[PDB]
Amino acid sequence: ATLKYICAECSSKLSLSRTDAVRCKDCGHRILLKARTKRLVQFEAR
| 26 labelled ligand-binding | no
Q: Encode burial over 13-45: b for 16+ CB neighbours within 10 A, e otherwise.
A: ebeeeeeeeeebeeeebeebeeeeeeeeeeeee
Q: Which is nearer to other proteins, 25 or 30 (CB)?
A: 30
- The entry of Zn ion, other proteins, none that residue 24 binds, CB within 5 to 8 Å by partner kind: Zn ion
Is 10 annotated in some ligand binding site? yes
Q: Smallest distance, Å, CB 4 to other proteins?
A: 7
The answer to whether 25 contacts other proteins (rule: CB under 8 A) is no
